[PDB]
């Protein structure tokens with residue numbers, strides 16, 4: 820053949836501003852956590868990645884909020900969404916229900932979702948835990964996944980790199996498995 824890679828997968832990352840969408844993408848693609856400048860949106864990025872028996876062409880689309888009441892081009896052609904909220908922001912968790920799930924039901928009804936809790940390094944910090952009465956536990960994260968019908972739930976930290984690869988590996992596997 821003239822093409823050893825025959826599957827393209829468009830993976831769009833969405834969720835509230837400042838939860839860590841862009842850093843996840845920089846972490847996954849570069850194996851580095853940015854310490855100075857972080858762009859609003861990661862460059863549109865595409866690369867071959869090996870998942871199981873396969874090499875696929877992964878296209879990563881980053882997003883940023885807009886005040887737009889027209890009722891997004893970036894969603895067109897999406898095979899899977901990574902829907903991020905921060906493990907230390909209740910508002911971002913509640914916005915998955917109030918903002919993001921409504922948006923995705925309207926604009927991308929049949930597209931699966933990988934639900935991602937970010938900033939695991941903060942949520943799991945014992946100092947943080949000791950001072951907060953009502954923490955977003957893995958249990959609450961799994962309850963959200965269930966409520967929204969997401970394919971998987973993953974907790975990660977771009978800062979320590981924990982489970983970042985798992986996010987996009989799982990996104991790919993959801994698309995490739997039945």
Ligand SMILES: Nc1nc2c(ncn2[C@@H]2O[C@H](COP(=O)(O)OP(=O)(O)O)[C@@H](O)[C@H]2O)c(=O)[nH]1
Nearest residue numbers: 835836837838839840841842857938976977978
């Ligand atoms: N502690 C910690 N901070 C993070 C992590 N990911 C992102 N951040 C910080 O969270 C803020 C927002 O990150 P960014 O990726 O720009 O979020 P985005 O608006 O969703 O794209 C920045 O100051 C990042 O340094 C993480 O895993 N752990």
Ligand SMILES: [Mg+2]
Nearest residue numbers: 841858859860
């Ligand atoms: Mg960003």
